[PDB]
Paper text:
SARS-CoV-2 Mpro is a cysteine protease that forms a dimer composed of two protomers. Mpro cleaves the polyproteins at 11 positions with a consensus cleavage sequence Leu Gln | (Ser, Ala, Gly) to release nsp’s, which are required to assemble the viral replication-transcription complex. In addition to the indispensable role in viral replication, SARS-CoV-2 Mpro also plays an essential role in escaping antiviral defense by cleaving host cell proteins.
Crystal structures of 11 Mpro mutants provided structural insight into their altered functionality. We employed crystallographic structural analysis together with a high fidelity FRET activity assay by our group to assess the functional and structural changes in Mpro mutants. The crystal structures of several variants revealed the changes in side chains orientations of residues in the active site comprising substrate binding pockets, especially S2 and S4, which might lead to altered amino acids preferences. Accordingly, changes in KM values for most of variants were observed, indicating alterations in a mode of substrate binding. We observe the highest level of conformational plasticity around the S2′ and S3′ binding pockets with N142 and S46 being the most flexible residues within the structures we solved. Also, we observed that the charge distribution in the active site changes quite dramatically even upon a single substitution especially around the S3′ and S2 binding pockets. This might explain why with most mutants we see the changes in binding affinities and not the kcat values.
Author numbering:
A (entry chain A), B (entry chain A): 1 to 306
The structure:
Amino acid sequence: SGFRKMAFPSGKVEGCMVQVTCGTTTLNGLWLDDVVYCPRHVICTSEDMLNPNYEDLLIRKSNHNFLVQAGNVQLRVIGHSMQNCVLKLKVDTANPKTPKYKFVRIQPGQTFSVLACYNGSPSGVYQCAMRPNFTIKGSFLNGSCGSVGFNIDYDCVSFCYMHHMELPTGVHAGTDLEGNFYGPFVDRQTAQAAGTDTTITVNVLAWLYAAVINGDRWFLNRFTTTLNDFNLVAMKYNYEPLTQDHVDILGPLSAQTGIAVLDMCASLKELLQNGMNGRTILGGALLEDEFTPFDVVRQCSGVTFQ
Amino acid sequence: SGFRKMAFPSGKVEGCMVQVTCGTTTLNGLWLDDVVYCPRHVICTSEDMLNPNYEDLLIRKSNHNFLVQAGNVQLRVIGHSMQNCVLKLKVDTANPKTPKYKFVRIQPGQTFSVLACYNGSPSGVYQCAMRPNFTIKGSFLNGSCGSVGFNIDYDCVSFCYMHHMELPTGVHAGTDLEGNFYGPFVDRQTAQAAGTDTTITVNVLAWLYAAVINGDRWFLNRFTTTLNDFNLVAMKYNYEPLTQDHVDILGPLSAQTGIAVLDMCASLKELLQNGMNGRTILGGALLEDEFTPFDVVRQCSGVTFQ
């Protein structure tokens, strides 16, 4: 038993983290096959980040201006290109530790594991979630740009996020592995407003189901609610509107615990209206929203990707 | 910026996780060099766990009764021995992915990363802490026995924990890699009382320093306290007594933020006596105690073990 915020094993990703140097700036790159992916603001300086003309800046750079170090190996760049906000540095040799991988663009509310790196070396791994405003609340210091988020499917690594910048409000923004930013963010040092953030309601319900599986049950009320009447309360507390697609997602969790989805929504409503009253759920005093229903089923059944 | 509960990269540990089968029971083993370490209750059944005579049970077993699978490789056991509560299965070939490693016995309050495994395959990684009562609050299902906790020091892996059993109260107990249990626990299915758990005070202060580094500052009071007068309040709220060794541990954190250790203790005292008043610290409403002062300095400076 027990429930933990759990990250994917990072072995298959560690072997792909390299160091990318261009001029004075260093950040992390992703070495898959014979291509190194890294944020395009590695060709910038601190003053360039204000109003960067990335096309004119990259034209100044040639093939031998990019220093790619893989642990103690250094790769020979035999081609470079700019795909949106990511740089594709064609290298000499293919990464022998290249895992089976895909590039995926996730949706708000989905979760993934982040391998925090500095100078191409993995520092740590933690789980996070794409906020509904396309930001993430991670831990990224200077030199952590290019750190990647991923999911594991048995043997296949689904790369979904690349860290690019810290917003002035302390939150983090990034792109997919095709260089397209999540949200309305641009790789430019300016005031960038992230929209109003809401709580992923379907994630909160999955985390309540996980609490029932583990014994914590004081929040199970004797009332119910409808889908509409719950959404009226959800809008008041900045919660995502629950759709029928979300209710069907919680089907398996509903089947295992014998508690209907609408019955758990009334428990959440009373948690929103009345609070927790000094009690805890799975050792916490806030409603956790960083576990998808697939995350809960994974930890509760013991899925082994190896 | 940002602060996350962060686990060590698990690459060096994944390559050492094997499957150990003896009779009907399966659990995870640790393959370092030519020795496989696994809990000794792999030679038991469900009824054996009541009153197990491990010496008489192991004597019934011979060398070819242990089925060790490493991914798709299966190893040839050429020797077996019982060191306390751990089994040492001498195998034919040495693990080619054996990292530089030590066996360490940690102290209560120290933290480590757990690689949750099932049938010898890594499921996920998360950070935890040795509670003052020598238990851990992890996520261990059936078949997760033999999962190991570890710390990374640059290139060296310090193995410190091996999971053995779930206590009836839902908490977890285990041994070091020499087979010696943490706490008064025995590998026997019975009622085993874990002592009163307290909060690691030195960890809470380190987590408050991390909050100051990240901007959250509303708890910084205009009062102070002495070491004794704080310990009187700490005993009332089930907090570990703060010693001079703990104050010196927080020295670097005190030097970076310009806040004396005793000044932060008065802030914690008012947090204990007055609560949080609906506010949050680093996105949480409870006083986190699973970050050692070394953990905070690590995440704040960007230490890369690779």
